[PDB]
Structure formats: C-alpha cells, structure tokens
Design a protein around this ligand. Structure first.
Ligand SMILES: *[C@@H]1O[C@H](CO)[C@@H](O[C@@H]2O[C@H](CO)[C@@H](O[C@@H]3O[C@H](CO[C@H]4O[C@H](CO)[C@@H](O)[C@H](O)[C@@H]4O)[C@@H](O)[C@H](O[C@H]4O[C@H](CO)[C@@H](O)[C@H](O)[C@@H]4O)[C@@H]3O)[C@H](O)[C@H]2NC(C)=O)[C@H](O)[C@H]1NC(C)=O
Ligand SMILES: *[C@@H]1O[C@H](CO)[C@@H](O[C@@H]2O[C@H](CO)[C@@H](O[C@@H]3O[C@H](CO[C@H]4O[C@H](CO)[C@@H](O)[C@H](O)[C@@H]4O)[C@@H](O)[C@H](O[C@H]4O[C@H](CO)[C@@H](O)[C@H](O)[C@@H]4O)[C@@H]3O)[C@H](O)[C@H]2NC(C)=O)[C@H](O)[C@H]1NC(C)=O
Ligand SMILES: *[C@@H]1O[C@H](CO)[C@@H](O[C@@H]2O[C@H](CO)[C@@H](O[C@@H]3O[C@H](CO[C@H]4O[C@H](CO)[C@@H](O)[C@H](O)[C@@H]4O)[C@@H](O)[C@H](O[C@H]4O[C@H](CO)[C@@H](O)[C@H](O)[C@@H]4O)[C@@H]3O)[C@H](O)[C@H]2NC(C)=O)[C@H](O)[C@H]1NC(C)=O
Ligand SMILES: *[C@@H]1O[C@H](CO)[C@@H](O[C@@H]2O[C@H](CO)[C@@H](O[C@@H]3O[C@H](CO[C@H]4O[C@H](CO)[C@@H](O)[C@H](O)[C@@H]4O)[C@@H](O)[C@H](O[C@H]4O[C@H](CO)[C@@H](O)[C@H](O)[C@@H]4O)[C@@H]3O)[C@H](O)[C@H]2NC(C)=O)[C@H](O)[C@H]1NC(C)=O
Ligand SMILES: *[C@@H]1O[C@H](CO)[C@@H](O)[C@H](O)[C@H]1NC(C)=O
Ligand SMILES: *[C@@H]1O[C@H](CO)[C@@H](O)[C@H](O)[C@H]1NC(C)=O
Ligand SMILES: *[C@@H]1O[C@H](CO)[C@@H](O)[C@H](O)[C@H]1NC(C)=O
Ligand SMILES: *[C@@H]1O[C@H](CO)[C@@H](O)[C@H](O)[C@H]1NC(C)=O
Ligand SMILES: *[C@@H]1O[C@H](CO)[C@@H](O)[C@H](O)[C@H]1NC(C)=O
Ligand SMILES: CCCCCCCCCC
Ligand SMILES: NCCc1c[nH]cn1
Ligand SMILES: NCCc1c[nH]cn1
Ligand SMILES: NCCc1c[nH]cn1
Ligand SMILES: NCCc1c[nH]cn1
Ligand SMILES: [Cl-]
Ligand SMILES: [Cl-]
Ligand SMILES: [Cl-]
Ligand SMILES: [Cl-]
Ligand SMILES: [Cl-]
Lengths: 337, 337, 337, 337, 337
C-alpha cells in the first residue's frame, strides 16, 4: 500500500516478473514496438585518418513500452538496479559501422533501468564505440569530412520493431560541448529510415557530423618549413658563382629536405593512391628548389665563356624566383580556399 | 489459437524447449544435418603484409533444420531474443585460418535466432575476424594476391554435418561495395569440398578474393623519389671538373639517399629472404648513381694529364646516362607489366 | 549465541539474506540513501598529453546503511568474502570522465565487504582508471594543468541517492605519496554538488589535482640544444669570409637542425592548432640562425667591392648576435616565468 | 534400442552424467590415468628475437579413458556438443613456458568432445600460444635456435596422471607445412619424462623445433650496404689529394653511415650484453673506413714537403685496402660458415 | 570403506561441502587463520624503465587450515579438480604494487586445490603480474635497482588473517634460474610485517630483488660511438688549416652527431628532471668536440697574421686534446665504478 513499504514494492516487482518471457518482444505477434532513442555525447576521443575511424563516448538511452511491466498502486517511477536488465527484454540495437565498442563496467556495469506505471521502460547505457568513417583526403589538410553513426536493429524487422528519435532534432545533445583539437563540428543531422536486406526491412537511425579541419597545425608543421626551405634555396642566388661548393651544397640540402618532408608527410597518412592538396604544394616547392639548383648548374656551365650572361642570369633569378613563388602560392591558396 | 496471444506463444516455445537436449545434433544417429551458409561482407578493414593477414567484418548466417523445433498453429516466423541461442544446438562452425576473431556485443551480442514452422533455424552473427593470408611479394608492389577465408566444422565429421553455400554463387554479398584504398578486388570465388584428417572427413567452405594492388601510392612514394635522385646525380655532369667538393658531394648525397630509401623500404615490409621488383628497381638506381660518382672519380683522376679526354668523357656522359636510364626504365616496366 | 560459533553466524547471515531484494535500494520509496566515499590514491601511473588523459590507481571505498542487513547478538563487524557483494545492493557509482577502468582480479577480485551491527555496509574496490584530462598547452612546457576525477550515480537521482566525502578534506589520502617524474602536485580539492540532466538531478563528487610541470627535462632536452645550435651558428662570424663553403655549411646545418628540432618536438605532442611557448623559443632561434646565414650572404655579396665594409659587418655581428640573443632569452624567460 | 532414436541416446547420456563428480579424476585413488596427446600444428605465426618468444597455433587433442562414461547398446562414437565439456572431468594440462595463450571462440568455443563405448574420451582444443624461447644470438644472424613447447599437468602428480605422445613419433603433425619467412625448421623432437618439484613428480612432454635462420634478408639489408659504403670510402683514393673537402667529406660520410648502421641494427635487437657476428662484421667495416680517413689525413699531412711519398701512399692504398678487405671477408665467412 | 571406491570419496567430499559457507573464513569470530605462502618464480619477462615496472611469472601457493574440510577414513591427500576452488573459501590475497596481473587459463584455469586429512588446504595459481618498480636512474647505466613485490590481504585484518613465509628463507625458489639479459640478480630478501591503515592492521609480505645492470650493451651502444666521434674530431688537427671546408665539416659533423646521440638516448628513457651518468659523459664529449671546433675557429682567425702561432696551436692541440680526454675518461670511470 504505502510507497515506502519495501515489501509491497518487492511483491509488485515479483508479480511483474512472474511468467515474464524474455524471449518475446512486447506485443509479440501484433503491432511493432516503437523504440525512441536519445544520445548524450560525452566526448569524441579522436579522429584517425590512418585507421579511418573515430572514437565516441555517449549515453545511449532507449525508450519503449512493455504492457507486461505495467504496475498499479505505486505512484512512483521505479529506478531498479541495473542487474534487473538481465531479467527483462531489451531491443537488439547495434551500431552498423562500428569496429570495437564496449559498455563501461566500473564500478558496476554502466546501465540504468527505469520503469513507469504504464509499463514504459527507459534503458540507458554508457557506450564507447570506435565507428568507421571513410574519409576523402583529396583536399587534405583543407578537407571537410562527414562521419556517421548508424543505429539498427539486428534481428527484428520493421514488422516487429520501429525506431524514432525521441525528441525530434533535440534527441542528440552535447554536440556543442565537444572539444576536438583538430576539427570543428560545423553541423549534425538526424535521419530515420528503413533499409531493405534479404531478410526484410530494418529500421535505421543515422547521427551524422560534418567536421571542418583546422589548418593552424599544418601551417605550423608543413607549409612554413616548405616556404623557409624555398627561401633558403633562393639564398644561393646572392652567392658568387665561383663558390661552387657553397651553392651546390645549398641546392642539395634544399632538394633533399623537400623530398624528406614529402616522404615523411605521406608516411604519416594512410596508403592512399591519389594526390592530396599538401602533396601538390610540396611538389611545387620541390620544383622550385630543383629549378634553383639547375639555374646554378647553368650559371656554372656558362660562366667561363660568358661571365656577363651568368651574372645577368643570377640577377634576374633573384627577382624571378620570389615573384613566381608568390604567384604559385596565390593560385594554390585561391584554388583550395 | 491466436498468434497474437503472448501466453500461447510462450506455451508453444516452452513446449519446444521442454525435453530439448542441446548436446545432441538434429537427427542424431541419422543422416547428416545440412547447414547452408551466407556471408554479407560489411567491410574489409585492412590488409597487412607485415603480419600477412587481413581483417574482415561480416554478417555470417547459418541455416539448418531441427525437427525438435517444429511448431504448429502459429503461421508466423518467430524472431526470438538472441539469448535463446544459448538453449539451442548450433553448429560448431569455425574459421580455419583466423588468428583473432570476436562477435560484437554492443548493445547486445550481435546475434539473431529465427525459427520457422517446419523446424528451420536461421542463426546470424556479426563477426570481425583477422584471417591469415600468406603473400608472394616477389612482384611487389605490382603483385596480385589471393586471400581466402576457410570455414569448417570443428568436432562433427561429414557423417554428422554437411556444408553448402546457400544460394550458390550468390551466397556472399557486399563484395562490390568493399572500399580498399590500396587494393582492388578483381574476383571472388566460393568453393565447397571435404577435407580428410586423421579423425575423418570434415566439410569445408572457402571464400577466396583476388586482390590487385594499386600502384599510385608507390609511384608517388618510391619510384618518383628514385628518379629524382638519379636526375640529381646527373646534374653533376654539367658542373666543372675543378669543383671537386661540389661533384663529390653530389655523388655522396645521391648514393646515401638511394641506400637510405632502399633500407627504409625493406624495413617497412616483413623480413623476407627473396628480392622484390621494387628492390630490383632501387638497386638499378643505386648502380646508376654509383656509376655517376665513379665517372667523376675517373674524370678527376685523368683530367690533369688529359683535360681534353676528361671534357669529352663528361660530354658523352651527359647523353649516355639519361639514355641508359630511360632504357632501363623501359625494360623494367615492360617486364613487370 | 557464541560469536565464535560459525553455525550461529551462518544462520544470522542467511536470515539477513533471506527475502533480500537486490533490485531495490535501501529505504526504497522513502528518504534518499546517503553514500559516503573515500579514496586512497595508490599512484598516478602516467599523464599523457598526446592522449589527454592520466592513469590513476586507487582504493575506492563506499559507506552506506541498509537496515535490511542489520543484525543483533554479534558484537563484532563481519568481514565477509567479496563474492557476497554479488548478493547485495551496491550503488551504481561510475566515473564521468574515465575512458578505460577496471577492478584488479588477482588473486581474487580486489573487493571488500564489511557489515556492521547497525546495518552499515562498507564496500571497497581497487580500481585502475584512465581518466580524460583536457590540457591547455599554450604555456607548455611551463604550464600548470588541472585534472579532475568525477564520481556520479548513474541511474538514481538525488531523490534516491546522495553523495558526500566521508571525512571532509581528509576524505582523500595518498596524494603526498604520488611520485610523478614530470609533474608536481601543488594542490588537491574535493567538491560536492548536484548536476541537472533531462532525467533529474544527480549527485556529483569531484577530486581535482593541480599539476605543475617540472622543467629540468625540457631544459636538458630542447632549450640547451637550441642554444648550442645558435652558438654554433655564431661561430661562422670568425671564419674568414673567403671560406665560402665552410660558412655556408655552418649556416645550412644550423638552420636545418633547428627546423628538424622544431618539427620533431611538434610531432611529440598532440596536433593542437595553436602556438606553444617552446614553439616561440624555437622560432626565435630559427630567426637568429637564418639571420646569421643571411648576414654571411650579404658579406659574400659585398666583400669583393668593399672588403673593409664586409670586415666591419663581421666584427659588428660578432657582438650584435650574442647580445641580441641574450636579450631575447631574457625577455622570453621573464614573460613565461 | 535404436541408435537413431534421440530419446534413447538422451536417456543414455543423462544416465552417464547422473551421479558424475567432475571433482574426481577417473580411477580416483587407484592407478594413474594415462592421457595421450597429439598436436596438429596449423602455423607458427611469428618468431620474435626482441621478445624472446614465438607464437604457435595448433589443434591440441587429449585422449584418456573414463569408465564412468562407458555406455552400451550404441555401436557409435558419440560426438557431443562442446558445452558438455563443462560437465566432464578434463586433465589440468598447461604449457610450462607459455606467456599468453587462448582458445579460439568463434563461432563457438573451438572445442571437441567425442565419447567411445568403452568410456574413452577425445578432447580437442584449437589453441594459440605465445611460448617463450631464450635465444643465443652470438652467431646472429647465422644462428641456429632451439625452441620448445613444454606440456605438464598442473595439479596431479605421477601418482594420478601420466602423459605420453599418442602415436609415438607421429604424435605431432603439420611441421613440414609450416612456412616461416625468416627460419627453416630443420628438425623437431618429442620428449616424455617426469620432473620433480617440491610437491612431487609431474609428467612432462616436450615438443622442440630446431630453426635455421635464412640469411638472404640480412645479406640484402646489412652486409651489402656495409660493403657498398666501404667501396665508397675506397673511392677517395683516386681523388687528388689537393681536393681536401671532397676526400674529407667521403671519409666523414662513410664513417658516420657505418656508425648509424651499427647503432640502428643493435637497437632493433634486444639489449644483449655480448657481441654478435654481425657486430663483428660492422666493427671491421668501421675500422676499414676509419683507416681510409686516417690514410687521407696522413697524405694531407705529408703531401706538402714530400709529394712523391704522398702519391706513393695513395697508389699503394688503392691496392692494399681492397685486398685486405677481401681477406677480412674471406676469413669472416669461413669462421661463421 | 576402501579409498579406491570413488562413490565413498564422492560421499565424503559432498559431506564436506554440505552446509559449507564460503562467506565465512575458517575459525570465523575466533583466532586469525594463518596463511603460509610460497613462490616459485618461473621467469622475469622484462624490466622496463620507460614504464617503471617489471613482468614476473610465478607459481604462487597458499597454505592454510580449514577444520570444516577435515575428513577421516581416507589416508590420502585429495587432489581435487580446480573448479572446486569456486566452492571453497580462499584468502583475498592481492599484490599491492601490481598494475596488470592475470591467472593463466589454458587449457584449464591454471589452479590447484589439494586437501589433507587434517583439513589443510593447499591452493596454487600461476600468475603473470606486472609490478611497478620506481627506479633511481641517477647512476644509470651503472645503477643498481631494488624491485619489490608486495603481498597483502584486502579485506581481512590481522585480527582475521596472518601471513608468513612457508619455509622461511627457502619459501621463494627459482631465483637463481632467472635469466635477465640486461640485469643480474645480486640478492633476494623476504620480509614479513604488519601495516596500519584507517581500517586496521593488515598482514604484509615482501619479496625484494636487488638488480645490477649489465654494462656491456651500453659500452657497445653509447660509450664507444662517443669515443669514436671524439677521435674523429681530433682528426681535424692534422689537416692543413687552409682546408677550411674540410675542418669545419669535421667539426660540424662531430658536434651534430654528439647532439643527436644525446637526444636519442634521452628519448629512449622516460622523461626525468635530473641528470644521469651517461648524460654527464655525453655532455663532456660534446664539450670536447665543440672545443676542437672552436680551436680551429681560433686558428683560422689568427693564421693570416701569425701563421707560426697557428701551427703551434695545432701542434699543441694534437697532444692536449687526447690527453685531456683520457684524463676525463679516467676520472669519470673512477667516480662511477
Ligand atoms: C553525411 O552523409 C549522409 C549520407 O549521404 C547524409 O545522410 C543523408 O541525409 C539526408 C538529409 O540531409 C537524407 O535525406 C532525407 O531522407 C529522409 C528519409 O528518406 C527515407 O524515407 C523516404 C520516404 O519517406 C524514402 O523515399 C527514402 O528512400 C528513405 O528511405 C527523407 O524523409 C528526407 O526528405 C526530406 O527532403 C525531401 C526532398 O528531398 C522532402 O520532400 C521531405 O519533406 C524532407 O524535407 C530526406 O530525403 C538522406 O537519406 C541521408 N542519406 C543516408 C544514406 O542516410 C548526411 O546528411 C551527411 N551529413 C551531413 C552533416 O550532411
Ligand atoms: C586462391 O587459391 C585457392 C587455392 O588454390 C583457389 O581455390 C581453388 O579454387 C578452385 C576453383 O576456382 C577449386 O577447384 C574446384 O574444386 C571443387 C572441389 O573439388 C573437390 O571435390 C571434388 C569432387 O566434388 C574432387 O574431385 C576434388 O579432388 C576436390 O576434393 C570442384 O568441385 C570444382 O570442379 C570444377 O572444375 C572441374 C574441373 O577442374 C569440373 O570438372 C567441374 O565440373 C567443376 O566445374 C573445381 O575443381 C579448388 O579446389 C580450390 N582449391 C582449394 C585448395 O580450395 C582460389 O580459387 C584462389 N582464389 C581465386 C580468387 O581464384
Ligand atoms: C632443445 O633443447 C632441449 C634441452 O636440451 C632438448 O631436449 C632434450 O632432448 C634429448 C633428446 O634429444 C633428451 O634426452 C633424452 O631424454 C629421455 C628422457 O630422460 C628421462 O627419462 C629417463 C628414463 O626414461 C631417465 O633416465 C632420465 O634421467 C630422464 O629422467 C631419455 O629416455 C633419452 O634416452 C635416449 O638416449 C640415451 C642416450 O642419451 C639412450 O641411452 C637411451 O636408450 C635413449 O635412446 C634421452 O636421454 C633430453 O632429456 C631433453 N632435455 C630436456 C630438458 O627436455 C631438445 O632435444 C632440443 N631440441 C632439439 C630439436 O634437439
Ligand atoms: C628494497 O627496499 C626495501 C625497503 O627499504 C627493503 O625492505 C626492507 O628490508 C628490511 C630487511 O632487509 C626490513 O627490515 C626488517 O623489518 C622487519 C619487519 O619490521 C616490522 O615489524 C617489527 C616488529 O617485528 C617492527 O619493529 C617494525 O617497525 C616493522 O613494523 C623486522 O622484523 C626486521 O628485524 C630484523 O632486524 C632487527 C634489527 O634492525 C633485528 O632486531 C631483528 O631480530 C631482525 O633481524 C627488520 O627490521 C624493512 O622493514 C624492509 N622495508 C620495507 C618497507 O619493507 C628491501 O630489503 C630492499 N631490497 C633488498 C634486496 O635489500
Ligand atoms: C507491506 O507489504 C506487505 C506485502 O504486501 C504486507 O504484508 C505488509 O503488511 C505491508 N506493510 C504494512 C505496514 O502494511
Ligand atoms: C492465450 O493462451 C493461454 C494459454 O492457452 C490461454 O490461457 C489464454 O486464455 C489465451 N488468451 C486469450 C485472450 O484467450
Ligand atoms: C551454534 O549455533 C547453532 C545454530 O544456532 C546451534 O544449533 C549450535 O548448538 C551452536 N553451538 C553450540 C556449541 O551451542
Ligand atoms: C526411444 O527411446 C525412448 C526412451 O527409451 C522410448 O520411450 C521410445 O519408445 C523410443 N522410440 C521408439 C520409436 O521406440
Ligand atoms: C562405495 O561407497 C558407496 C557409498 O558409501 C557404497 O554404497 C558402495 O557400496 C561402496 N562400494 C563398495 C564396493 O563397497
Ligand atoms: C660562438 C663562439 C665563437 C668563438 C670564437 C673565438 C675566436 C677568438 C679570436 C680571438
Ligand atoms: N575440424 C578439424 C579438426 C582438426 C584438424 N586437425 C586436427 N583436428
Ligand atoms: N548519471 C548521469 C546519467 C546521464 C547523463 N546524461 C544522460 N543520462
Ligand atoms: N605442475 C607444476 C607445479 C609446480 C611447479 N613449480 C611449482 N609448482
Ligand atoms: N588491504 C588494504 C586495503 C586498503 C588500503 N588502503 C585502504 N584500504
Ligand atoms: Cl570500463
Ligand atoms: Cl564489439
Ligand atoms: Cl589486474
Ligand atoms: Cl579468437
Ligand atoms: Cl593465458
């Protein structure tokens, strides 16, 4: 009778679970059971291009109605121990594009079961999942990616289970609180549909983020060293042509440094066959430094018979190379921005 | 009487599982139980030459008949909770060449049990398996590999269980949707046979893929740097022979860069005792740059007494080296393509 | 009767657990259960900037009261086997910012259950948790970070469970015994509050540390090499200006070494998009070495027509560069200390 | 009666397992139970000098007799579901030198239980184990290693259990099909004995392989680069002694390359306190390149006053160095082969 | 009657376990139960300074007396199946300073239960534990470390459980068979005491090893390259001072090689704020090579006006530098040995 009478609550719960068959979904053989889902995104741990996946930690909450769990006489919502979730029926929800996921289990399994007088069940889990995200790196590092989390029922079709976002556009919360050092979340979308396979139509939910990559790290890491190496190559134009060792050493060092930068950058990323934007910039810088070395080679070749022509070539290169490099940078940064 | 009456369905399921012995296969002591298998490949995560394996995520579905599970009066297929699979006999199917594999268990064990009125059981799992694949890298990176997944019964012989691809050549789906950045799937084949061991004959299914390696990454990563270093070595032929430091530095840097490229490339791949195609190309490039350095050494040796001969040697080298390297590249690319 | 009579104690415990419902919290339907918590920190294993987290091993003890477990006639506290914790209600306490935590299980599960005559339960665990800690590295490596451990109830709201630090400021011990090679713990704080989510208000505890980074490692690893490279660059001001190869080699090696140091240091840290203090120092050192190389370029450019001016420029550089670098170091170390 | 009558077989199995005590070994208190063991080696995954261990995948089958499981009236071998193994007594067989081993569990636990009418039990497991193997790398990479797998009973002494290799020399199969890229399996041996510990005498089986390391990888990776660097050092002898920068650069680059090769190779292997064969070869090559540099230093020292002596020294070095290096290689390869 | 009657033994064991309460320790409410412990160290896998820990595999055996398990009429020691350990009381023994430990589980859980007529239980496990060991690397690599394993009861205090080494100083065996390539075990000690915490006094056992680091690897890896680089720097003293490029290149290469060696060695070890012995040696070698380069700088500065003084400085350096470096090595090795 009294809500505080734990004996009465125990009797009510035992009556609820007596004869309860966990093998049967609510309203088995009848209308599909509607499961409304919410996500509270705690954080996005990392976004990996090498593995083409991102790690996501969230509170995943499911909401459905089981008339077998309807109780009367207790005007309270029963928050039960998570272990009771083993004695109930729960949807076979799984993430379609994940690779490794787990439910946290310290100190207890991170699980919540709440029953309502009308038979409504709220079932919450804390899930850290590494979801696969194929990425198009043709504009890297100035690229924008779209990473999705796909939620689907495993065994039951749309004739047995239906999904919806509980709350419309506000079902997924906490996106604005995500701190990604390298990315900024431009937008997120919720999609609900049905996907047909050989075994029938299955409900599907999709939580998609659009990530815009920050460029400051790559400016500090790759572009500035390339510009500095190109200017270092230009330095040889003010050295006298008789100093063969000095200018040849400058050319060799700049060329080898550009090649090492390019190879190291490519080794950092996964083995993709196409050419990226940063690869184009590095190849342009390599062309510039190699042309500077070839210019000195020409000057050394012709400076014995025609010293005036060699001096003129050096003097003209001193102006041509910075101007042409400025034009190359201008067109490059206009194309990719 | 009523398919929508959950009490009747519970009674029927309990009657099916009453007296059910999970230790005995269907038709125990009689004809072998036929199990048909389908695979829906979600993705191929990675292909590693270093570990000689590949990761594969799939929906693995088995189909058999258990007359003990035949039910009447319910004109519906019973999609039961996955936990009921712990109370039923399931085939001891395993992957012969796998190293690590698991079944995804978020938010529940990715498992599906469907019963049919005639006693047919459909049993689905979502499995991520890392299968070993020995690779013949003698034509690397222009090689073509053949990686197989072998499926076999562990304890039961052909007198007890038989395997067949359910649907013939259409048993495996999703192969055309696989996105491997480094490989392209030329073909896939399904094979069914029996393998004899000391304990008897066992059914065996095989799903084999033929992968062709995309060459763009290795063109951008290894071949182009080698060509550029060889051209850089050629640059020394236009430098005056009195500039000993410059030309010796050019030769040294080219030789050392070629050696470092070769060693790094060999370190990237697993330790194999034979020579790869890319190794042949790198050794040829090293020979060319070393011959350039030796040519300068000869010119420096003879340029005091015979300056005209030294100048003639430099002039002839300026033509001979590019032409010979072009011929070497031509024959190399004709041999391996 | 006799406390040493094991049969009497067994009967008492069986009476305690007879009719006990683990699905219901103590005082279910009435006042919330107050759960006090103590932490004895065994060690902070590591602090990772790349992963933005820290590993922490602790003895986490919870203290609550369940009148269902009150016993009389035994004037002793019952230290029971840890397995009995599976037959009792325990709080659904979890860590908000953890990423991978576990309870040690050798030789048995590192778990303690102690019962008191009035029904008080003490429940201890040994937990190794990897808690996330976002770090602001703008003053790196002279930064001061703040890492928190958040403790919260998962299912029950403040209407059911309340948290408090058992012992106040002395509720957490072992902080003074923490030996971090790279950090020193300036202070730790304990905070108790309530956090409101869509499902209601939940209790919250926070154990926060203020970590100060030791600077000796970075002095020995980054700053001293940069200073030595800058002094090496200054060395070229004493070499004769006609030794073009020597001075150009000095400039090239110093500039390239500075760039490689900067790039390696950036690659040792997470891909943050901003500029750190050590990045500013490295950029200053790079500017100094580049200015030295450009100074030699100017001297070589003008040394044929105006040798006296070139000698004067070298002589003035010998004084200006050390003085300017000393001023730069002075202002840098005054700004960041 | 009918072997195909599943009810009769279920009754027989229930009678077999009724009153069965898994805590008691067969013939408890009497003669020891003989367990015969077979191994079908599927593969040897990898051999690690750094970790001093090797990974092995195998089908491990045990054969014993349990009179409690003897059944009559069924002239068939009962292949039972693997789960029945949880209800039977199985030997406590473990691997003495293993470090991390597991039983494959997809799709089910890779376990086989087969019973015979006379109570004979065949129990098979597919096991992957990382077994430690201490290696003597004094003759590395021309070394020959001996790696063993040790099988022992953990709790039962020779008064309770006895091991034997079932089939004798043919107990272990699949050795000839093992494909190790770096090693070749010269021989394998099977040993059976008893080992005395503080608790008594325990049965012991040993499966040992003798592996011979292939040399092709190290020929292409370490020896050839060293030889090429030594020839590069010799190149300086034909350069004129007035080209001080060129010859000094050749000496410096060869010496530094040799040192880096040696240090990298030592870093790849575990921190062993002794000298390997390849270490001896690398030290010899370093001695040769250092002697070449010192020879140029002597020539540059004495070439001003005595040009004829310097030219004679260079001419003699051109012959002495290649010949002495050939002799060194000859004696080195004779000693280690 | 007869011990060979398995039915009688099963009856005896069932009577022993009938009414057995695993929640109560032996002599609950009375005198503390004394637990005697033995360790048979199988191996010490690896000692890591970076992680500051060591991996240890051991047979850990506990010995106690439970009068509830005393049986009569069977003059034998009952070696029971390890699974019966789940039906008995076992001490809550744990390792105070472990980080990740597991009990091996192939083929079965590596566990042993042996009962004696007087109710004495022997309980053995095979445990691989990674125990933290704080190390003082000030005298590294000539350091001597002290790594301990701490064994303690988790829940029971000294009023309930007491620990002692069974066999005194011979309780721990197998120490002399430990093969650490990088360390030699000078001594091992056993300590027994009691530690007071807020919850009471707990028994404590300690097994400590004193490890002395072998110096051969570091002699071959760090000291010899440093000495060789210093001699290489000395080489420049015999080169003519007019060869500016050669001597400046020698100085630059030696200085940069020393810096790279020091930085790489510091990177190998964990980040520590103090200076190690090898750091002192490397800094001394850097000072020597830098002083050689500065000596050449002075010679080049003064060799135009005072050629005789420059020649005298070179000649005196040729003797001073080797002698001073020999003195530095002598004092360094005397200090640290
Ligand atoms: C990352 O990339 C993914 C994949 O490309 C993007 O996901 C797509 O998102 C769009 C919305 O932005 C989806 O389009 C919408 O689909 C809804 C569901 O369609 C299902 O049901 C209808 C019948 O009702 C079927 O015809 C259909 O085949 C599906 O089964 C529609 O209801 C939406 O309709 C809206 O637009 C139409 C006009 O086009 C209007 O008439 C409607 O009123 C309504 O406004 C819409 O079509 C698309 O389906 C998603 N694709 C997938 C594969 O899921 C992510 O958006 C992207 N991430 C970001 C951040 O952009
Ligand atoms: C990667 O590499 C693997 C291994 O080499 C390849 O696998 C082989 O694939 C071929 C098919 O492409 C297989 O050949 C087929 O084998 C079937 C099974 O043979 C067993 O059973 C028959 C009796 O039914 C026995 O006679 C036989 O000895 C075996 O015990 C056959 O049924 C097939 O028959 C077909 O061809 C024959 C002619 O050869 C015709 O007469 C038939 O009518 C029919 O058309 C066929 O022979 C081969 O067995 C596979 N090998 C293994 C070890 O499994 C993969 O194909 C490769 N990857 C790719 C992509 O190609
Ligand atoms: C890798 O390294 C390991 C360790 O060194 C090698 O293992 C040894 O292998 C040899 C065989 O090659 C073993 O020697 C044999 O041991 C048998 C068992 O001895 C026990 O039992 C007998 C009674 O049966 C006792 O007397 C004895 O004390 C032991 O308790 C013997 O039965 C064998 O005897 C055979 O040879 C002798 C002559 O030597 C004859 O007189 C006999 O008639 C008979 O033919 C033999 O002595 C040795 O025990 C193994 N040691 C260990 C520690 O396991 C591996 O062989 C090696 N790997 C490879 C590939 O070689
Ligand atoms: C690595 O480093 C650790 C930590 O420093 C070393 O461990 C210490 O080892 C020494 C022995 O070598 C230990 O000293 C011994 O402690 C015992 C326990 O003391 C407790 O109990 C006594 C009462 O029984 C109390 O008085 C005391 O306060 C403690 O509560 C003592 O029983 C031992 O007594 C012995 O020496 C005394 C004289 O000092 C004699 O009178 C006794 O008869 C007896 O011979 C002794 O004092 C010390 O406690 C250990 N410290 C820790 C923290 O465990 C390791 O030894 C070291 N590794 C190596 C290889 O050396
Ligand atoms: C509490 O509920 C139980 C079970 O219905 C009942 O027996 C008991 O009387 C109730 N308590 C009171 C005070 O009525
Ligand atoms: C459902 O089936 C049960 C068992 O046969 C029966 O008792 C019950 O009356 C049925 N439901 C209805 C509405 O008749
Ligand atoms: C111990 O308690 C049991 C249960 O109350 C009782 O039957 C037994 O007699 C007691 N022991 C003694 C010695 O009285
Ligand atoms: C099968 O065995 C059971 C149990 O002995 C028996 O009741 C049944 O009649 C048998 N089947 C046939 C067809 O005889
Ligand atoms: C073995 O012990 C059981 C149980 O006491 C008994 O029933 C049986 O007769 C004994 N066997 C013999 C041969 O005495
Ligand atoms: C950067 C330090 C350079 C030291 C040169 C010393 C020359 C002294 C000439 C009197
Ligand atoms: N199902 C194959 C089992 C096997 C192979 N080899 C030995 N046992
Ligand atoms: N105990 C907090 C549960 C939660 C957070 N967000 C959503 N649900
Ligand atoms: N069965 C091996 C038991 C053992 C070895 N060492 C100590 N105990
Ligand atoms: N067995 C010691 C338990 C402990 C330590 N600190 C707090 N509790
Ligand atoms: Cl966790
Ligand atoms: Cl998973
Ligand atoms: Cl652990
Ligand atoms: Cl597995
Ligand atoms: Cl294990």
């Amino acid at each position: 009778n009294d809500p505080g009478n734990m004996s009465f609550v125990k009797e009510t719960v035992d009556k609820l679970l007596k004869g309860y068959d966990i093998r049967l979904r609510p309203d088995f053989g009848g209308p599909p059971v509607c499961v409304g889902m919410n996500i509270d995104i705690a954080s996005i741990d990392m976004v990996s291009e090498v593995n083409m996946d991102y790690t996501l930690t969230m509170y995943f909450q499911q909401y459905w109605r089981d008339k077998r769990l309807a109780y009367s006489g207790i005007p309270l919502n029963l928050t039960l121990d998570n272990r009771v979730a083993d004695q109930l029926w729960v949807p076979d929800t799984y993430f379609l594009n994940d690779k490794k996921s787990f439910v946290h289990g310290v100190t207890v399994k991170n699980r919540m079961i709440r029953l309502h007088p009308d038979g409504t069940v709220l079932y919450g889990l804390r899930i850290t999942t590494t979801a696969a995200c194929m990425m198009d790196l043709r504009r890297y590092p100035l690229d924008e990616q779209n990473c999705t989390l796909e939620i689907e029922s495993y065994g039951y079709t749309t004739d047995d289970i239906e999904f919806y976002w509980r709350g419309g556009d506000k079902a997924v919360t906490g996106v604005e609180r995500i701190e990604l050092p390298q990315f900024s979340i431009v937008e997120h979308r919720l999609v609900s549909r049905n996907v047909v396979f050989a075994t029938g139509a299955y409900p599907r939910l999709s939580l998609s983020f659009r990530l815009k990559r920050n460029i400051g790290y790559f400016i500090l890491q790759t572009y500035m060293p390339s510009i500095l190496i190109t200017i270092l190559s230009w330095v040889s134009f003010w050295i006298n042509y008789d100093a063969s060792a000095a200018r040849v050493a400058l050319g060799i060092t700049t060329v080898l440094t550009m090649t090492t930068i390019n190879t190291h950058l490519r080794e950092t990323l996964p083995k993709i066959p196409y050419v990226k934007a940063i690869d184009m910039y590095l190849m342009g810088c390599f062309v510039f430094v190699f042309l500077a070395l070839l210019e000195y080679a020409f000057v050394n070749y012709i400076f014995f018979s025609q010293p005036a022509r060699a001096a003129a070539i050096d003097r003209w290169s001193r102006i041509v190379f910075p101007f042409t490099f400025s034009l190359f940078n201008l067109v490059y940064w206009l194309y990719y921005v």
